[PDB]
Design a binder for this molecule. Structure first.
Ligand SMILES: [Ca+2]
Ligand SMILES: [Ca+2]
Length: 86
């Protein structure tokens, strides 16, 4: 058992780094990519709208790839990536 799940491919995480584990494996995504376990185990931007309890707490969280956009919308004082309209 405990085979090389990282050897399967170099882009296993589609960005991060595939790790090895007993009867299983993991990955080390990049920026904000979250293991695309829903598809396999690649890199699929996390839920920036959930990573922070203040994120667009009073605006809009347009979670995007390897990042997220916050909208009060503009005209106010919403943090670019700090999470919290102002
Ligand atoms: Ca293994
Ligand atoms: Ca994201």
């Amino acid at each position: 058992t405990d085979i090389d799940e990282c050897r399967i491919s170099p882009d296993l995480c589609g960005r991060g780094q595939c790790v090895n584990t007993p009867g299983d494996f993991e990955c080390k995504c990049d920026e904000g990519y979250e293991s695309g376990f829903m598809m396999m185990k690649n890199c699929m931007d996390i839920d920036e709208c959930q990573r922070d309890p203040l994120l667009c707490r009073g605006g809009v969280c347009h979670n995007t790839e390897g990042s997220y956009r916050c909208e009060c919308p503009p005209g106010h004082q919403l943090s670019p990536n700090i999470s919290a309209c102002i």
